[PDB]
Amino acid sequence: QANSLPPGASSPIFGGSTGGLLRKALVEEKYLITWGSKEEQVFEMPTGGAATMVAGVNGLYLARKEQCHALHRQLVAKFKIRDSKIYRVLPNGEQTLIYPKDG
Amino acid sequence: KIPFLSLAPISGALFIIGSVVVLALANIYAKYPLLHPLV
Amino acid sequence: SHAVKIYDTCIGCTQCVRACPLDVLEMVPWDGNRAGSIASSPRTEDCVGCKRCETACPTDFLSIRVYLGAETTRSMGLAY
Amino acid sequence: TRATVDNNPVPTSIEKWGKPGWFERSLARGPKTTTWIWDLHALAHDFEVQTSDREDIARKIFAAHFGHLGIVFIWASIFFFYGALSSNYASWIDNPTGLRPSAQFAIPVFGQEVLNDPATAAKGFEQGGIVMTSGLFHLWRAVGYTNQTQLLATAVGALVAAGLMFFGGWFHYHVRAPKLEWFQNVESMLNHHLAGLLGLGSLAWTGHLIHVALPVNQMLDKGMKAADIPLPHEYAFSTEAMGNFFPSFKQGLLPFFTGNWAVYSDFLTFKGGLNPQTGSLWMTDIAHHHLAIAVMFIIAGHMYRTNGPWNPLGLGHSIKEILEAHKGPFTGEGHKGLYEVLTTSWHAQLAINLAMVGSLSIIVAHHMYAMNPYPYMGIDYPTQISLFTHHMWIGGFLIVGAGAHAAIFMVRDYDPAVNQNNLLDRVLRHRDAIISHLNWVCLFLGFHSFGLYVHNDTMQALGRPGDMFADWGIQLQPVFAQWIQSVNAAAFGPNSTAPWVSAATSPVWGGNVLALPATVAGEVVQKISIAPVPLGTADFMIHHIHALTIHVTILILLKGVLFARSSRLIPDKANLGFRFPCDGPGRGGTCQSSAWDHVFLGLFWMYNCISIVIFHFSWKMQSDVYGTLNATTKAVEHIVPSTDVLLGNGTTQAFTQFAASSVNINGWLRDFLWAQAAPVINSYGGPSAAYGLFFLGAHFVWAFSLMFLFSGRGYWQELIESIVWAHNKLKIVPTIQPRALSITQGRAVGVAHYLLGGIVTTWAFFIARFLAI
Amino acid sequence: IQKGSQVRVLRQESYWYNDVGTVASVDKGANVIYPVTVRFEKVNYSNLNTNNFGVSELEEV
Amino acid sequence: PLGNTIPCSESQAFKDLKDARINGLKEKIAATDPATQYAKDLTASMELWEYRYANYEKNASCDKDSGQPHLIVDGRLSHAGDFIIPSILFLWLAGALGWAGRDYLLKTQNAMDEILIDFSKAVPSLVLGLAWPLFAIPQILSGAIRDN
Ligand code: CLA
Ligand code: CLA
Ligand code: CLA
Ligand code: CLA
Ligand SMILES: CC1=C(/C=C/C(C)=C/C=C/C(C)=C/C=C/C=C(C)/C=C/C=C(C)/C=C/C2=C(C)CCCC2(C)C)C(C)(C)CCC1
Ligand SMILES: CC1=C(/C=C/C(C)=C\C=C\C(C)=C\C=C\C=C(C)/C=C/C=C(C)/C=C/C2=C(C)CCCC2(C)C)C(C)(C)CCC1
Ligand SMILES: CC(C)=CCC/C(C)=C\CC/C(C)=C\CC/C(C)=C/CC1=C(C)C(=O)c2ccccc2C1=O
Ligand code: SF4
Ligand code: SF4
């Protein structure tokens, strides 16, 4: 609904925490990390807890870009996944690429 | 260099305890002065 | 936002981009070293001021200097 | 099972004694700065940064445990040597009430022989001595020590046991050392710590109690002297000597095998509370105690399933099946993963065990003042204040360490692959709710206890004593706690809940003031050991202070545990470690965000907690329990007198001093902290002058901490830059570069000196007050 | 200034201002502003001892 | 007799606390067994106290009012034992330790040798610290090192 994924990305299985999005994600900005995994495996959330991601393309909305870039260094340092791309989602629905800005 | 006694806390601590014992027996031998006697 | 400057003492060791928790920096081609690259910050609106780039810079005094300036939502590091 | 052990991992050599800092990479390169020196000390017992091999880690832990049991046996030998050689125990065994216990004398050098107290001068010890507050003498009298040569024998045996634990450490590290799956059989270690360590330990102590300690205490309470029989009242050949003391059933142990247990009811009894002759628990109840909990601990060590070569043996539980059976709909997948957590993480185990032993030392501190275990100990008031205070401080220390190693598990040993939807993972999914509701209840407790105290200060200052939250004003009575007083006092008689108890649980519940003969120069009976302890409005207020301080120490340590790995501020905090100073001045500032800093802050908040606990104890026991029976008509006079509270009409009403003067902070300042510190500041030129010196030196160490606490290292480093310039000007050049302390070490040095200075201040105050009156 | 020569740092903002260092390698390119690599016996606050300085910031002793 | 200062030979209050201490010691020996190591220690303390009060008498210690000894440190040779002899004794032993440590740093210049003390370079440094002025004063007259 208010946190809809782009088409092609499927949600990882997470049971919901209290450390996630707050009212800023509705009114100022939120962020989206989108990566590609070869299997289903278990990763620590940057906001607390653990989640399971599936094979294919996985997207996650976070309040904060350092939460996304901390998730990205976790995927590199544990699961060798380097195709995370980080978007800044505005509340009107605009999406801009902010990592990799080089490509 | 010798084992375990060349180490700086050991050499240091035996220096402090030896100085305190030499100063202590100096206070016994001089009958615990406040000043140095002149006469 | 915080003000990040790169001086001419840089050696291109690639340790400030890796230690940066935000991807503020990037390497552009340069001629002043043997690595052929110098750090740059065109993403200073996204910097928190955490000074992990300055921790991992191996010179005498640091080629990267971040100056604490005006504070935003992004630079105070708020998830709210 | 089977104890799979490898042979000779580490050769014995002196090739690492000459190389300090061998054990991790940055210290192996050598001293460059002085920071290395402090990094030599702070990492020496962190075996997980030494080697990454969990096998070898468990071996270092095991050899460390043997060396610790060695150093505790060395300390046990040191007080047993001081009991045997330089004591008045040969005359303290005849007078436990008029002779102060001492085991140490100052030698006549430099003027310190005024520290020797004249009231410890007796036969065998004609020097004067330092009065002990440890209760070692009362323990020894309760366990049957009548002579100093058996104290010599125990001292030699404890030195031999220290040597045995050192040889066990050297054997189970360097020579013949077990692998990790031996440590992971938690089933058998629970079964052999319940049935074998606790169970057979208290059964062998029951054996000691019956054979030695109940008859020697019966000889000492019927009225003979130190000339006793250690050996010919023992064993088979003097079985009738067991019948001469408290009637050993019919004949021998043949009542034990035929099952008539009722004839053994004269040294295995269930009577009740305290003996009025000696002020302590009846020794027969203590023996039947240790036997019933011995039985029920060997029963507890028959619970968990262990499979091996024994045929029918192997029925029981695995812990893992129990944990994976307890699931629930609110808590997802429950306790699955906790077996793998507690069998692969040492820090999680140490967190649980430190919480439990700290909580148990706090329970010991309560249960030992209230029900006095050792003869004539409750009348020796510095022992009572010092044992309660000591076990409370050791308990608060191990509870802060519990929070520390739970945070350390969260940094290092937490694996997401183990914790899918268990209790541990779901606690991380609502850590904001836990910490914020804890923040609210700490705010509530602080307002609704300390603002009550502030309100009393304000109303008593304004000339409004009837406006006060007090027993004479707005009453706040402990009606659940008073109802539990009435229940635990009233449950002794016929047609009660427990119909075969003679003298109830404890006299603190509401029944009778107990007293004992004692000399005190040339006086009368006097000296209450124990009394009913009444709860009024001041007790409501002090216990809500206690709830506040416990809850805030919980808030600090539990916020360290749950936000060890990530937050909304620093999401990558687990890569920064347990122990880092900050993540820079940015994002507002991340000063003291690590979980180590939460242990650092919870240390002061534990200090706060336990200081108000022992302050409540000191003046509650002094104002309502301890004191004197007057020679005229059995009147109770406490150590601090009753206060006539002036009312708003003009008349007075008598309260005790606890009830009158801790409704506010002014009476805590005046009647507790100004008034009772008179013997620690006037103690010079006498036997308590060391406590005055320690009072002043501890004020010094406490204030000296505040340099390290309020400042930071960049000041100090550019100051050392000026000092290093002064050193290089005179060709005085350290190769080891002089540095300021690290930020984390400046916090650690400050919290260490703050804790040492405040606790030794209160220690000096407590002993110098309670030796006087 | 070549390999093995003892030099003194003239840079005002250095840790090792007025201190003797050892030249370890000199870069043979002309586009580098600070070619001369100098090791020191003393380490800085970052626990390192090697840095690239220029020719004009160094005095031959 | 200086300002708020009279010496021991005509001070009333010194005589008062001297008589108080010797009388307290007199009834402290007089109430105990002479063969229990307490009485021998208290007669040793009495002999020590008689010698220290006579030492305060003879070498002009100075009291007034409070009766206890006030020290004069302005540089008089009559009160030279107040400050001047422990000044020279301090400068000898402190220059010994400082020069021994400085000479140890000059001869080692090594990081293992600071945390592991080599006694063959430490105890000759201490022996030459015991003769430190003769090797310190020509290096004062020469000059140490040029650094800014
Ligand atoms: C930040 C913390 C810090 C720390 C941990 C240190 C630590 C140390 N410093 Mg130091 N320093 C610092 C800050 C610090 N410093 C600062 C801020 C400055 C000012 C710029 C200095 C300037 C400084 C200097 C100038 C020196 C040190 C030295 C030392 C080392 C002393 C070794 C020792 O004590 O054993 C002491 C060993 C002995 C005293 C040997 C004697 C033992 C004898 C031989 C045994 C036989 C005696 C026998 C038992 C009989 C006893 C009787 C007796 C009276 C003789 C030690 C490792 C000294 C050093 O380098 O090591 C020698 C040294 O010279 N430091
Ligand atoms: C069963 C008890 C137990 C055990 C086995 C451990 C074990 C460990 N702790 Mg821990 N801890 C405990 C209880 C325990 N702790 C308690 C009760 C507290 C609350 C105070 C803490 C709080 C704590 C913190 C905050 C940290 C640890 C850390 C560690 C690890 C390394 C410690 C080290 O290197 O040694 C080094 C020891 C020292 C440098 C000694 C420090 C100076 C002491 C405290 C002063 C002593 C004063 C003395 C008692 C009284 C004055 C005497 C004086 C005047 C002479 C190690 C795994 C550290 C770690 O990094 O974890 C992985 C860590 O930072 N612990
Ligand atoms: C005496 C000094 C002092 C005081 C008053 C406090 C007070 C507080 N601390 Mg603190 N703390 C202290 C020293 C102090 N601390 C020190 C030295 C350290 C260093 C180790 C810390 C470290 C520390 C930590 C790490 C934490 C606290 C927390 C708290 C809060 C606890 C919640 C509570 O008690 O409820 C209520 C508040 C009080 C009891 C304060 C007094 C309130 C008065 C009586 C009411 C005044 C009436 C009215 C408002 C006045 C209006 C006048 C008008 C003119 C303005 C509380 C506000 C914890 C927290 O935030 O939990 C919620 C927290 O985690 N403290
Ligand atoms: C070789 C040892 C040595 C020597 C010659 C000096 C000399 C000096 N110091 Mg220094 N210092 C030392 C060690 C030494 N220090 C150590 C170990 C520390 C850390 C505690 C310091 C901390 C220090 C500070 C903060 C200051 C000085 C200052 C000074 C200068 C003024 C005199 C003074 O204030 O004394 C002061 C001396 C101390 C405070 C340290 C106490 C003495 C130490 C313990 C002696 C070291 C013993 C050493 C181990 C002996 C080795 C024997 C060898 C044969 C094995 C002076 C040139 C002051 C200055 O800059 O003046 C302009 C200044 O403020 N020092
Ligand atoms: C104080 C101390 C000490 C000492 C100790 C001791 C003295 C010891 C001991 C000990 C002992 C002396 C122990 C014991 C024991 C025991 C036991 C463990 C038992 C048992 C048993 C059983 C098993 C039985 C069984 C049975 C039954 C039940 C049924 C019927 C039949 C029969 C009888 C068989 C020392 C100095 C070292 C050090 C410090 C501490
Ligand atoms: C110049 C000099 C000097 C001097 C110094 C000074 C001036 C000082 C001081 C100081 C002060 C001014 C103070 C103090 C203090 C301390 C304290 C206070 C401590 C301690 C400790 C301990 C050891 C502890 C113990 C304990 C515990 C463990 C807990 C409980 C309680 C008790 C106590 C038991 C000297 C002599 C070195 C020498 C020469 C040089
Ligand atoms: C045998 C034996 C005992 C030998 C002793 C070994 C020898 C010879 C010297 C050892 C030097 C000693 C004893 C202490 C140095 C500690 C030091 C440089 C403190 C300055 C400092 C202060 C005052 C702060 O407040 C502070 C606050 C926050 C962060 C950092 C700091 C900080 O860095
Ligand atoms: S201050 Fe922190 S966020 Fe900013 S560029 Fe440096 S490392 Fe990156
Ligand atoms: S600024 Fe520092 S960390 Fe970044 S490339 Fe240059 S030398 Fe390396």
Closest ligand (CA of F104): 4
**D175-198 CB burial, b ≥16 within 10 A, e <16:** eebbebebbebbbeebbbebbeeb
Angle A12-A15-A16 from CA coordinates, rounded to 5°:
100
Please state whether the peptide bond connecting residue D494 to the residue before it is cis, i.e. omega within 30 degrees of 0: no
With contact defined as 3+ CB pairs under 8 Å, the chains touching A are C, D
Q: How far is CA A84 from the centre of its chain?
A: 8
What span, in angstroms and rounded, lies between the C-alpha atoms of D606 and D612? Answer: 10
| Min distance D127 CA to chain F CA atoms (Å) | 6
Report CA(D204)–ligand 5 centroid distance (Å): 4
Q: Can you name the residues that pair with E58 across neighbouring β-strands? A: E9
Q: Which helix (H) or strand (E) holds E7?
A: strand E6-9
Tokens 């945390």 map to which residue? Answer: F115
Terminal Cα-to-Cα distance of chain C (whole angstroms): 18
Please state, in angstroms and as integers, the Cα–Cα distance from residue B17 to each residue in B9, D36, F94, following that order.
Answer: 12, 26, 17
Q: Is the CB–ligand 2 distance for residue D356 below 6 Å?
A: no
Question: Using alpha carbons only, how large is chain A's radius of gyration in Å?
Answer: 13
What span, in angstroms and rounded, lies between the C-alpha atoms of F30 and F32? Answer: 6
Tokens 């071996």 map to which residue? Answer: D59
Which two structure tokens, joined as six digits, stand for D626?
């301890």
Q: B24 — phi, psi (to 5°)? A: -65, -50
Does residue D332 contact residue D426 with C-beta atoms inside 8 Å? yes
Task: From D209, D205, D203, D163, select the one nearest D70 (Cα to Cα).
Answer: D163
Q: Which helix (H) or strand (E) holds D298?
A: helix D283-300
Task: From A78, A96, A77, select the one nearest A86 (Cα to Cα).
Answer: A96
Does residue D212 contact residue D143 with C-beta atoms inside 8 Å? yes
Q: In what order do the strands lie in the sheet with E20-26?
A: E50-53, E36-39, E20-26, E6-9, E58-60
What span, in angstroms and rounded, lies between the C-alpha atoms of D94 and D225? Answer: 6
Does residue D662 contact residue D541 with C-beta atoms inside 8 Å? yes
| Amino acid, single-letter form, for residue D511 | G
Return the residue whose CA atom lies nearest to atom 6 of ligand 9. Answer: C10
| Amino acid, single-letter form, for residue F11 | S
Closest ligand (CA of D555): 3
Please state whether the peptide bond connecting residue B37 to the residue before it is cis, i.e. omega within 30 degrees of 0: no
Task: From D299, D287, D286, D288, select the one nearest D194 (Cα to Cα).
Answer: D299
Does residue C72 contact residue C6 with C-beta atoms inside 8 Å? no
Does residue D683 contact residue D698 with C-beta atoms inside 8 Å? no
What span, in angstroms and rounded, lies between the C-alpha atoms of A53 and A37? Answer: 8
Torsion sign over Cα F56, F58, F59, F61? positive
**Ligand 8 atom closest to the CA of C19, numbered from 1:** 7
Tokens 């009753």 map to which residue? Answer: D642
Q: Is the CB–ligand 8 distance for residue C6 below 6 Å?
A: no
Residues after which chain C has a gap (C–N > 2.5 Å): none
Q: Which of D691, D754, D760 to mutate to test the pocket of ligand 6 (most atoms within 8 A of CB)?
A: D760
Which two structure tokens, joined as six digits, stand for F103?
């000479």
What span, in angstroms and rounded, lies between the C-alpha atoms of D334 and A74? Answer: 27
**Ligand 3 atom closest to the CA of D454, numbered from 1:** 44
Q: Around Cβ A93, how many Cβ atoms within 10 Å?
A: 7
What span, in angstroms and rounded, lies between the C-alpha atoms of C1 and C69? Answer: 6
Which two structure tokens, joined as six digits, stand for D720?
């050392």
Angle D148-D154-D155 from CA coordinates, rounded to 5°:
90
Q: Which of D724, D725, D727 to mutate to test the pocket of ligand 4 (most atoms within 8 A of CB)?
A: D727
Mutant choice from A31, A64, A99 vs C, greatest count of C C-beta within 10 A? A64
What span, in angstroms and rounded, lies between the C-alpha atoms of B35 and B23? Answer: 15
Q: Is A95 left (phi over 0), alpha (psi -120 to 50) or beta?
A: beta
Instruction: Kindly state the DSSP code that residue A79 receives in the 8-state scheme.
Output: I
Q: Is the CB–ligand 1 distance for residue D723 below 6 Å?
A: yes
Q: F60 — phi, psi (to 5°)? A: 55, 60
**D297-331 CB burial, b ≥16 within 10 A, e <16:** bbebbeebebeeeeeeeeeeeebbeebbeeeeeee
Method: cryo-EM
Mark yes or no for CB contact E16/C59 under 8 Å: no
Does residue A76 contact residue D572 with C-beta atoms inside 8 Å? no
> What HEC string does D591-645 produce?
CCCCHHHHHHHHHHHHHHHHHHHHHHHHHHHHHHCCEEECCCCCCEEECCCCEEE
Which two structure tokens, joined as six digits, stand for D303?
């619970």
Residues in Cβ contact with E13 at an 8 Å cutoff, skipping those fewer than 6 apart: C60, C61
Residues in Cβ contact with D48 at an 8 Å cutoff, skipping those fewer than 6 apart: D57, D412
What span, in angstroms and rounded, lies between the C-alpha atoms of D595 and D414? Answer: 14
What span, in angstroms and rounded, lies between the C-alpha atoms of F7 and D633? Answer: 60
**Ligand 8 atom closest to the CA of C64, numbered from 1:** 6
Mutant choice from C4, C48, C73 vs D, greatest count of D C-beta within 10 A? C48
For D588, the closest of C51, C52, C77 (CB atoms) is: C77
Residues in Cβ contact with E50 at an 8 Å cutoff, skipping those fewer than 6 apart: E24, E37, E38, E39, E40
Angle F95-F98-F100 from CA coordinates, rounded to 5°:
100
Q: Which helix (H) or strand (E) holds E39?
A: strand E36-39
Mark yes or no for CB contact E45/D717 under 8 Å: yes
Q: Is B2 left (phi over 0), alpha (psi -120 to 50) or beta?
A: beta
Does residue D573 contact residue D564 with C-beta atoms inside 8 Å? yes
Question: Using alpha carbons only, how large is chain C's radius of gyration in Å?
Answer: 13
Q: How far is CA D703 from the centre of its chain?
A: 26
**D658-675 CB burial, b ≥16 within 10 A, e <16:** bbbbbbbebbbeebbeee
What span, in angstroms and rounded, lies between the C-alpha atoms of F90 and F77? Answer: 18
Does residue A33 contact residue A59 with C-beta atoms inside 8 Å? yes
Q: What is the dihedral of CA D688, D690, D693, D699, to 10 degrees?
A: -90
Instruction: Kindly state the DSSP code that residue D50 receives in the 8-state scheme.
Output: T
Tell me, in Å, the resolution of the deposited structure.
2.4
Q: Is D306 left (phi over 0), alpha (psi -120 to 50) or beta?
A: beta
In C7-71, DSSP assigns E strands to: 26-29, 37-40, 64-67
Q: Which of D32, D33, D34, D36 to mutate to test the pocket of ligand 1 (most atoms within 8 A of CB)?
A: D34
Please state, in angstroms and as integers, the Cα–Cα distance from residue D143 to each residue in D10, D101, D138, D212, D242, following that order.
Answer: 43, 16, 9, 8, 17
